[PDB]
Amino acid sequence: GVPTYGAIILDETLENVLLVQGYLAKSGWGFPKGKVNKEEAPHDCAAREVFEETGFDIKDYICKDDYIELRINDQLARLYIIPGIPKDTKFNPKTRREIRNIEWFSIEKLPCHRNDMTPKSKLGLAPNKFFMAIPFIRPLRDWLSRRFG
Numbered sequence: 001g002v003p004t005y006g007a008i009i010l011d012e013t014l015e016n017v018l019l020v021q022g023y024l025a026k027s028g029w030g031f032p033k034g035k036v037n038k039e040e041a042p043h044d045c046a047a048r049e050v051f052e053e054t055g056f057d058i059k060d061y062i063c064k065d066d067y068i069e070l071r072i073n074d075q076l077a078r079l080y081i082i083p084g085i086p087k088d089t090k091f092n093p094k095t096r097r098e099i100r101n102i103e104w105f106s107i108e109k110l111p112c113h114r115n116d117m118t119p120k121s122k123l124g125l126a127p128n129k130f131f132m133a134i135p136f137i138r139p140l141r142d143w144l145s146r147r148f149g
C-alpha cells in the first residue's frame with residue numbers, strides 16, 4: 001500500500017488529542033492523515049494532509065524524530081507528534097466533502113482496543129467509532145510517558 005502520513009496533535013495540557021471524522025468508509029474518528037504523493041517528502045505529506053483536513057499548518061512544529069509509525073496490513077502509517085497546540089485553535093477543513101467534524105478527545109477516555117462479543121459467544125469485535133485511532137493509542141500513551149512523564 002502507499003505510505004500515509006499525518007499528525008497526532010495534542011493540546012497544551014497533553015491530555016487531549018485532535019481527531020477528525022470522515023464520511024462513508026472513513027465515517028468514524030481518526031487522526032488526520034493521507035497517502036503520500038509521488039516524490040513527496042514524509043514531512044510535507046503530513047503537513048499537507050493535516051492542513052487539508054483541519055486547516056492547521058504543522059510545518060513549523062514538526063520534529064523529525066517525534067512520530068509513531070505502525071504497519072497495518074502491509075501499509076505503513078506514520079503520525080508526527082505535535083504537542084502544545086491551544087484548544088481554542090480554529091480548525092476548519094479545506095475539504096468538507098471529506099471531513100464531517102473535527103474535535104478534541106480526552107486521551108484517557110479513548111479506547112486502546114475494541115470490545116469483543118464474549119457475552120454473546122460470538123467471534124469478532126463490536127464496532128467502535130474510534131476504530132481508525134485505536135491502534136495508535138497505546139503507543140501514544142507510552143511515547144508521552146517516555147518523553148514527559
Ligand SMILES: CC(=O)Nc1cccc(NC(N)=O)c1
Binds near residue numbers: 133135
Ligand atoms: C492507511 C493507514 O494509514 N493505515 C491504517 C491506519 C489506522 C488504522 C488502520 N486500520 C485498519 N485499516 O485495519 C489502518
